Amino acid sequence: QTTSPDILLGPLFNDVQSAKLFPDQKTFADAVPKSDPLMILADYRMQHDLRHFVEMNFTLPAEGEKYVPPAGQSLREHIDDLWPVLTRTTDKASNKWDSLLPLPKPYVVPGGRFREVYYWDSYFTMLGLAESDHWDKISDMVDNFAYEIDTFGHIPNGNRSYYLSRSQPPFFSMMVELLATHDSDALKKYRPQMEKEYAYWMDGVDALQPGQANKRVVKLDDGAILNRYWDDRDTPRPESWLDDVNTAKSNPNRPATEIYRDLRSAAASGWDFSSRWMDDPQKLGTIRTTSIVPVDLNALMFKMEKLLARASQESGDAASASKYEALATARQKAIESHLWNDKEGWYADYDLKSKKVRNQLTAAALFPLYVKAAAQDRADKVAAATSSRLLKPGGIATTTVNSGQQWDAPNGWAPLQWVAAEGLQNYGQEKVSMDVTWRFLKNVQHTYDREKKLVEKYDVSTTGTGGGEYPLQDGFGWSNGVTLKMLDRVCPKAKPCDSVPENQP
């Protein structure tokens, strides 16, 4: 169950990963022992051919499903036909030593070649399910996330043992809100698990003095309470073991454990990786996620607190509703006084090392508009910065730094397209909102026209190309989900489109 493979297999795990015995570091992270790892290990230490020894003692991950859809489908039919195809049930594990954490209900994976399910991308996958009326699948996934909250205290990065030490951008409260638009007391039903996740993020906050940090919560010098991304471990990621070992070796002037913590926590941020987190965008050894208060995360926390207040007011609990309402007020006040870059005119992360708000513009700047924490004048300023600097021919850019990392220029990511279009709409910036929507839709359609698939990310400098991208044609959750939602928006409800139309109106 809950012992991750790097502790389970000890030096054999570091030996197999270091030998580059497999092309993907994740492959051996998912290898299931055929017997007691204590036996395997004692076996290993005496009889030190490593490839044969591994094959005789582990069932490696099976070469997965290569689903081929029939050709000639429209973009919408293609997406809609894929929801059943990517529903999977992992009810039991193969043995006690399997890294896959079993889950109660069927869940929807981003792609057939995915071996587990993740947190924040599922919300955008769930937008598509909602759009195409798959409420049972949505309820199945919300049950799964509630189960994880009740069993592990939080939602792990994914349902793998080696993900238990970290979470991801906390969209659960918004999943419940989505489910609630169809099962109207989902918010009352899942308030206990919402409260428990909130406690996970705020763990230790009452004990904090100005200037202190603890796990995922910090307190600035003026008392302001904000959250940060944080992984509880500080070892190489089992699923990226040799990469992290080498990344820390590239910067021996800082303890490898700090580099590991910051690499793990950027994976928790969902932006793995990005110049957003790096002192030097060319050197991943300079990443310092845990010293950066993220503006998107704290927008999500504001939303979580407002939904907690609402979920309490609906249960008749006036004291609890009143408590979360004050917490959300303090959170909005802290976002506005610490995560706003006045000189540049946009929202931005806060630097714990320098105790200033940072200059870099990223697509995270749209998140306070998304959750309606921004004042109107700042929303208008973010929209001016968005069309001036981030809006590219194929959608909204992730950053303005082309670093080689994936959460950076020139890549556009479906969840950020949606967060931009919605946040801009929230404040009357319909023209920019529609520009983001139309350009990303054109990028997704044009890429579908040429590749007959959707992929995990798109190059926004043109239209028609994605990424190293997803190699099958059974393609990608949050792109599919966001595409359905946006495609509904650019045609009348009365006569929806199954393809992106030629001209924006």
Q: Which active-site residues does the annotation give?
A: 272, 456
Cβ atoms within 10 Å, residue 313: 16
**Token reading at 37:** 């790892």
User: In whole angstroms, what separates CA 123 from the centre of its chain?
Assistant: 9
- Fill in the DSSP letter of residue 390: I
In whole angstroms, what is the distance from residue 113 CA to residue 108 CA? 12
Q: Where are the alpha helices (DSSP H) in 292-407?
A: 295-314, 318-338, 367-370, 376-385
**Three-state secondary-structure class, residue 148:** helix
What are 354-357's contacts with CB under 8 Å, separation 24+?
355/220, 355/221
Integer angstrom CA distances of residue 255 from 261, 286, 287, 486: 10, 11, 12, 45
Facing residues of 459 across strands? 411
Contact between 360 and 399 (Cβ < 8 Å): yes
The DSSP-derived string for 18-70 is HTT-SSSHHHHHTPEESS-HHHHHHHHHH---HHHHHHHHEEPPP------PP
**Three-state secondary-structure class, residue 180:** helix
**Three-state secondary-structure class, residue 356:** strand
In whole angstroms, what is the distance from residue 107 CA to residue 175 CA? 14
Strand order in the sheet with 292-293: 292-293, 350-351, 356-357
